[PDB]
Amino acid sequence: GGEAKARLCKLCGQKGHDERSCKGEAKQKQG
C-alpha cells in the first residue's frame, strides 16, 4: 500500500524514503 508520489532512495536504493530526506551530509575533507 502507498498513495504517495516518491521514488526509492537514491543513496540507499530502497523503497519507502528518498535521498532528499536521507542524511546525505558527509565530511568532504582531504587528509
Contact residues toward Zn ion (CB under 5 A) are 9, 11-12, 22
**Residue 30 CB, nearest distance to Zn ion (Å)?**
26
Residue closer to Zn ion by CB (options 7, 28) is 7
Are residues 10 and 18 in contact, defined by beta-carbon separation less than 8 angstroms?
Answer: yes
Which residue minimizes CB distance to Zn ion?
A: 12
Residue closer to Zn ion by CB (options 6, 11) is 11
**3-class SS shares of the chain: helix, strand, coil, % to 5:** 0, 0, 100
Looking up cell 536521507 gives 22
